[PDB]
Write a protein that binds this ligand. Structure first.
Ligand SMILES: O=C(O)CCCN/C=C1/N=C(c2ccccc2)OC1=O
Lengths: 121, 113, 9
C-alpha cells in the first residue's frame, strides 16, 4: 500500500549541492504532511524540515541547521518529495529518511528505507 | 528551541520484565490547539524507525498492547508491560508541537541478564 | 578531498 522510497544520496564533496527525492505509492500524496528526518552514522534522529498538505496550504518549516541551505519541495502531480541540499558539510553526512504524517496527531507514521549521504573528502 | 531530555541512556532488561523510559521536555509542549504532539518511535538495529504512540498516549495501529505512553506536562513516559526480544532497539521520543521539532537523544533497550 | 578540492531558541 503505502510506499516511500528515497534516492539521490551518495558520496559528495564538502560544500556543493545534491537533490534527494522520495517516491510515493498508496496514498493521495497531496493530502499529507511530509518530512525529512536525518540520522548521522553518529546517533540521534534529527528532524530537518517538514511540508504540510493542501488542507494547510502546503506550509513548510525547517530546523536552523538547514534553514538557508536545504530546501524542501513536492511534486504533487508525480507524487514525489525532494530535498535540495546546498553547500553541504560534515554534520550533513547521514541517512536521510522520508516520512508521511498520519491523519491524526502523528508526523512520521510511515518512514522510507532511507538513503545515505557522505560529505567530507 | 525546546529540547527533549530522555533517560536512561541505556536500559538493560530480561525478556519479560516491564520497562520504563522517561522523557522530560524543557517547557510546556502543548500546541496552540489542544494537543501535545509528543510521539514515540522504536528504531531496531539497522532499521527505519517505527511510530509507536503518537499523541501523549495513543497507540499506532499495528503496535501491540504492551506499549503505552502518557503523562501530559513536561514529563512524559513510555512503558512496555512485557518486553519481547523484538522490542530491543533504540527508542526516541519526538516533540511535534513546537517548531523547531525535536527528538530525544534516545534510549537503547538491550538485554540485561 | 579530490579534484579541484545560553545560545538556544
Ligand atoms: O486517515 C485519513 O485517511 C487520511 C488523511 C487525512 N488528513 C490528515 C493528515 N493529517 C496530518 C497531520 C500531520 C501532523 C499533526 C496532525 C495531522 O498529516 C496528514 O497527511
Amino acid at each position: 500500500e503505502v510506499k516511500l522510497v528515497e534516492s539521490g544520496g551518495g558520496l559528495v564533496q564538502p560544500g556543493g549541492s545534491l537533490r534527494l527525492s522520495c517516491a510515493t505509492s498508496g496514498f493521495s500524496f497531496t493530502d499529507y504532511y511530509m518530512a525529512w528526518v536525518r540520522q548521522p552514522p553518529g546517533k540521534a534522529l534529527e528532524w530537518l524540515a517538514f511540508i504540510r498538505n493542501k488542507a494547510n496550504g502546503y506550509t513548510t518549516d525547517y530546523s536552523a541547521s538547514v534553514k538557508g541551505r536545504f530546501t524542501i519541495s513536492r511534486d504533487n502531480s508525480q507524487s514525489i518529495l525532494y530535498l535540495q541540499m546546498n553547500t553541504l558539510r560534515a554534520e550533513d553526512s547521514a541517512t536521510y529518511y522520508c516520512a508521511r504524517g498520519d491523519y491524526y496527531g502523528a508526523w512520521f507514521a510511515y518512514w522510507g528505507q532511507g538513503t545515505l549521504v557522505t560529505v567530507s573528502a | 528551541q525546546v529540547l527533549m531530555t530522555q533517560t536512561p541512556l541505556s536500559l538493560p532488561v530480561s525478556l519479560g520484565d516491564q520497562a520504563s523510559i522517561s522523557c522530560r521536555s524543557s517547557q510546556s509542549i502543548v500546541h496552540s490547539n489542544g494537543n501535545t504532539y509528543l510521539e514515540w518511535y522504536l528504531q531496531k538495529p539497522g532499521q527505519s524507525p517505527k511510530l509507536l504512540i503518537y499523541k501523549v498516549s495513543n497507540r499506532f495501529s499495528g503496535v501491540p498492547d504492551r506499549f503505552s505512553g502518557s503523562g501530559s506536562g513536561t514529563d512524559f513516559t513510555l512503558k512496555i508491560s512485557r518486553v519481547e526480544a523484538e522490542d530491543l532497539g533504540v527508542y526516541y521520543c519526538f516533540q511535534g508541537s513546537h517548531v523547531p521539532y525535536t527528538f530525544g537523544g534516545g534510549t537503547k533497550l538491550e538485554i540485561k541478564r | 578531498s579530490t579534484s579541484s578540492g545560553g545560545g538556544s531558541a
